[PDB]
């Protein structure tokens, strides 16, 4: 029942630890700001290893109670504990990081105090350790400190956080550590600075390793992180296994797994012909079509899935096969259906883009017509055009998209009859006056397809298309000028 510590003696601290076990003396110890600071002082300066751990272990026991935390807190224990994270005694390290962990969990203001003490840099530097239980605690501290705190995220990045965390995911199998580390990566994955770094470290491939782990919380966190990372990332190697697993996960009974899988696949296939090839080769088209069908009106699933299908049906060696595969796997009816309510604009925009690609395949021309793609595309176009003449999706995008789809569909003679029968020529001619070059292009394009039929060519001329087409001959956009010349010729 004392309060005085004498230098050069291990007896004092050695006795103090023995008391912190018994809750009786322990409360007395933390009900007293006296020796608590003296405990800290001893730990912070003592070069006797055996004293340090006896000291740190004492503080650890105190961190189990609300006032014991406050005691350590108001006694300036946090900077001391942070300093102790440089200790070469594994026993001391464990107590330091654990006590800090407890403070971070419960003690108000501890998070800020640790950051100020330079705790982040020290913790990141400890990520090269090899004890999984120690790493699990350290990574948990990092997660707590990084969540909702951009300042901490940037510090973790500057300290080499991303590479160290990815190395952990590539190395260990301890679930608790893999889960907690993935949680840190998820928090960092929404940072515009951390994200490219995680990707460069090989983070996507590493996270892909655990997508078939029995732990659902691990799989889901890896999926959430992957969705963030895959958005407009640099081209990567070794993505084969990951892409394969993602396709498999599309058939999961877990909706969040399915939603993430579709989203990642969409992100990874956008303007990436290599990935498009791989996804198609492992049956990606069929899996995505089944996913869309099962999803119904759930646009959180259909939107990324349709986006992925749009990517897969364009600009790669097996694009044509993918275009046929959508039809062969009973996908055409549901695609047309998604153009109708209750579909919102992002889905509609994506669906229009998909139809445009599907129309590149001649064997899709008739089924798309039979399923009623043309009148709905025209109604969407007419209304979208009116809106532009009166934040999400701009109606200008819908105008360009629908006209673009009609341009491709107009390759078929029967489609041209349907398209013109819907009083579209006056609208297409008006779109020639659009300020947007891309709208001018598809407008002149569909008119060019239509004008190959004599009767339609006369109707285009009667609509007074000659004057704007002549102006478009001098368009800085070569595509616009080429189509404009082609229409003028056939007239």
Contact in structure between 335 and 298 (CB atoms under 8 Å): no
Residue with tokens 């096969």: 321
Residue with tokens 């700001």: 33
- Residues 392-423 as b/e (b if ≥16 CB within 10 A, e otherwise) read ebebbbbbbbbbbbbbbbbebeebbebbbebe
Structure-token pair, residue 25: 């003396």
The closest of 227, 231, 146 to 180, measured between CA atoms, is 146
Distance of CA 301 to the CA centre of its chain: 14
User: What's the domain count of the chain?
Assistant: 1
The closest of 206, 198, 270, 252 to 228, measured between CA atoms, is 198
Q: Write out the residue range of the structural domain in which residue 286 sits.
A: 1-491
Structure-token pair, residue 397: 């995008």
The closest of 402, 374, 373, 371 to 386, measured between CA atoms, is 402
- Between CA 371 and CA 334 the distance in angstroms is 9
* Cβ atoms < 10 Å from Cβ of 253: 6
Residue with tokens 């601290």: 13
Contact in structure between 348 and 366 (CB atoms under 8 Å): no
For residue 165, say if its preceding peptide bond is cis, omega within 30 degrees of 0: no
Contact in structure between 26 and 71 (CB atoms under 8 Å): no
- Between CA 153 and CA 150 the distance in angstroms is 5
The CATH number linked to 43 is 1.25.10.10
Name the experiment that determined this structure. Answer: X-ray
């Amino acid at each position: 029942l004392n309060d005085e510590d004498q230098v050069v003696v291990n007896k004092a601290a050695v006795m103090v630890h023995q008391l912190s076990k018994k809750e009786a003396s322990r409360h007395a110890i933390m009900r007293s700001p006296q020796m608590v600071s003296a405990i800290v002082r001893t730990m912070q300066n003592t070069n006797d290893v055996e004293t340090a751990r006896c000291t740190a272990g004492t503080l650890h026991n105190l961190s189990h109670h609300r006032e014991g935390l406050l005691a350590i807190f108001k006694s300036g224990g946090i900077p001391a504990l942070v300093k102790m994270l440089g200790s070469p005694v594994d026993s001391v390290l464990f107590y330091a990081i654990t006590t800090l962990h407890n403070l971070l969990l419960h003690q108000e203001g501890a998070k800020m105090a640790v950051r100020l003490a330079g705790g982040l840099q020290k913790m990141v530097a400890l990520l090269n350790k090899t004890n999984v239980k120690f790493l699990a605690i350290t990574t948990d501290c990092l997660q707590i400190l990084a969540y909702g705190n951009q300042e901490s995220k940037l510090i973790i990045l500057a300290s080499g956080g991303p590479q160290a965390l990815v190395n952990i995911m590539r190395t260990y199998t301890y679930e608790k550590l893999l889960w907690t580390t993935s949680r840190v990566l998820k928090v960092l994955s929404v940072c515009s600075s951390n994200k490219p770094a995680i990707v460069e470290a090989g983070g996507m491939q590493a996270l892909g390793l655990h997508l078939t782990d029995p732990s659902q919380r691990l799989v889901q966190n890896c999926l959430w992180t992957l969705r963030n990372l895959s958005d407009a990332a640099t081209k990567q190697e070794g993505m084969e296994g990951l892409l394969g697993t993602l396709v498999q996960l599309l058939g999961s009974d877990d909706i969040n797994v399915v939603t993430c899988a579709a989203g990642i696949l969409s992100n990874l296939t956008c303007n990436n012909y290599k990935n498009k090839m791989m996804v198609c080769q492992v049956g990606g088209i069929e899996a995505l079509v089944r996913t869309v069908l099962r999803a119904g009106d759930r646009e959180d699933i259909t939107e990324p899935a349709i986006c992925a299908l749009r990517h897969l049906t364009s600009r790669h060696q097996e694009a044509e096969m993918a275009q046929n595969a959508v039809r062969l796997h009973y996908g055409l009816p549901v695609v047309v259906k998604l153009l109708h309510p209750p579909s919102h604009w992002p889905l509609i925009k994506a669906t229009v883009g998909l139809i445009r690609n599907l129309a590149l395949c001649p064997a899709n021309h008739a089924p798309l017509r039979e399923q009623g793609a043309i009148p709905r595309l025209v109604q969407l176009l007419v209304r979208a055009h009116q809106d532009t003449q009166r934040e999400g999706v701009r109606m200008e995008e819908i105008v360009e998209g629908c006209t673009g789809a009609l341009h491709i569909l107009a390759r078929d003679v029967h489609n041209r009859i349907v398209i013109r029968g819907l009083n579209t020529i006056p609208l297409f001619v008006q779109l020639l006056y659009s300020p947007i070059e891309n709208i001018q292009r598809v407008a002149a394009g569909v008119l060019c397809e239509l004008a190959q039929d004599k009767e339609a060519a006369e109707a285009i001329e009667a609509e007074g298309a000659t004057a704007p087409l002549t102006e478009l001959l001098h368009s800085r956009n070569e595509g616009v000028a080429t189509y404009a010349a082609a229409v003028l010729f056939r007239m």
